[PDB]
DNA sequence: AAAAAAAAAA
DNA sequence: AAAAAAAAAA
C-alpha cells in the first residue's frame, strides 16, 4: 500500500508523461491509465486497489472525480485547483530543517520546485514533514491572517495541509 | 584496450589500491604480479606484457617499473614518498584550469584539492588539455617558477612534463589567458 | 588517467 | 509521498 501511494505521487505530481499520461488543466488522469501505468511496476495492482489508497490515505491525497484521478497538492508542474479558501485557521506551521533557516529569514517559504508553498495546520504533520529533509527540523508558526492582509490566500489543499503561493519573512512569528 | 586498462591502473594505483585488495608501500609502490591479477577481476585478457606496454608507451610518463614494483609516479589522492629530482631548470610553468575557479584562485592559489600535490606541467597543450577535463572555458595560467622556489616551494620532475609542488600562492601566477 | 555499484534530493 | 535506471566529479 506504502509502495503503490509513493509511485501514485511520483506519476500524479512530478512525472506523468513518464508514463505515457498527459493529465488535464485540473491535473486529472484517468483512473484506467493509471491502473495499467500503475501495473507496469506492480502488476497486481487494481483498481479497487486503488481506490482503497485514496478513500483510506490519512493527508486526502488524492480525488477522484467520476473517471479520473488527481494529486490535489504536491505539483512541481503548474496546475490549476479548485480548492476552497482557507478563512478560518489563525496560525499555520511549516517544519524545515534548521540549515534553512538564515534564507528563509531573509526571503521567506518559496516554492522550490513545487507549484505551491506547503503548510499544514497540525504541528505533527509540519515537523514530519520537516524531517524528510533532514535531522536538526525547525517548527515555524505562521501569522494567517498576516498572510492574507498581504495578499497570499491559504487554500484547503488537504486534511490539514494549506497551500499557498509563498510566505514572506514577516509573518513568520516563531522558530522553535 | 590500451587507454581503458591504463584508465582503471590509474585509479588503482593513485585512488583505492584497497578496493582490489591491494597495499601500496610508503613510495606508492605495488607489487606488477598482484596488480596483473587485479585488472584480470575487470579484463581478463591483460597481461604482464602488456602491461609493460603501457608503461613504455605511456605519452605523460605515468607509470614506473622498479622490479617486481609498480607505481604511479603522480596524481595520487592518498599520500605518497617520491623521491623526484628537483625541478631547477623551469623558469616558467603553466596550468589549465575552468574559467570558473579563477576568483578562487587568485585569492587563495592553486591547492592540491583531493590529490597531495598541484599538479603543473612544462607544456602548454598538455596544462590546458588537463583543464579541458573539468570544463569547456579553460585558461592558461602561467607560473613564475622562481616565485615559487624563493617561496620555498620546491618543484619535483614526477612526469616527462608534469611537475608537482606543494602549492602554487597567488602572486607566483604572473598570467592568466 | 578516477572506476562503477547502488541509493535516493527536491 | 519523488520513482529509479544508469552514468560518471575529483
Ligand atoms: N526560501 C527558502 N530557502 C531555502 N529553503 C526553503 C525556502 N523556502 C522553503 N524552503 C524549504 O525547501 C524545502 C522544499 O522541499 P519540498 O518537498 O518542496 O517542500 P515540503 O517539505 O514542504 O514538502 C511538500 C509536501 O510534500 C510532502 O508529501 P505529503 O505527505 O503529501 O505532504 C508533504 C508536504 O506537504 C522545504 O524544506 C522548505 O522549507
Ligand atoms: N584554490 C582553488 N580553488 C578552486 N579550484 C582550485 C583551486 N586550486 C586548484 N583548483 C582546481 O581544482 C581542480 C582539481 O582537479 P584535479 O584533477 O585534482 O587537478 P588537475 O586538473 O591539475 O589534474 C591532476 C592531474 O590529473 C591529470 O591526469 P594525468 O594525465 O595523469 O595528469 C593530469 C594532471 O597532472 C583543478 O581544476 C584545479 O585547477
Known amino acids: 500500500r506504502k509502495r503503490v501511494s509513493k509511485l501514485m505521487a511520483y506519476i500524479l505530481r512530478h512525472s506523468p508523461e513518464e508514463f505515457g499520461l498527459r493529465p488535464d488543466v485540473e491535473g486529472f488522469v484517468s483512473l484506467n491509465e ?3 501505468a500503475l501495473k507496469t511496476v506492480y502488476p497486481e495492482v487494481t ?4 481506490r482503497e489508497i485514496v478513500e483510506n ?9 467520476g473517471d479520473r484521478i ?9 496546475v490549476s485547483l479548485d480548492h476552497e479558501e482557507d478563512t478560518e485557521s489563525r496560525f499555520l506551521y511549516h517544519g524545515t530543517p534548521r540549515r534553512n533557516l538564515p534564507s528563509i529569514l ?3 517559504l518559496k516554492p522550490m520546485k513545487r507549484q505551491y508553498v506547503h503548510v499544514s495546520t497540525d504541528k505533527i504533520e509540519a515537523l514530519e514533514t520537516g524531517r524528510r529533509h533532514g535531522r536538526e527540523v525547525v517548527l515555524l508558526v505562521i501569522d494567517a491572517e498576516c498572510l492574507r492582509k498581504r495578499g497570499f490566500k491559504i487554500y484547503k489543499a488537504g486534511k490539514n495541509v494549506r497551500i499557498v503561493e509563498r510566505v514572506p519573512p514577516d509573518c513568520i512569528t516563531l522558530a522553535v
Not at 47 to 50: A, H, L, R, S
Not at 57 to 65: A, H, L, N, S
Not at 70 to 78: E, K, T
Open 47 to 50: 483498481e479497487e486497489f486503488v
Open 106 to 108: 531573509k526571503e521567506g
Open 57 to 65: 490515505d490519512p493527508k486526502g491525497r488524492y480525488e477522484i472525480r
Open 34 to 36: 493509471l491502473v495499467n
Open 70 to 78: 488527481r494529486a490535489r497538492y504536491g505539483h512541481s508542474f503548474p
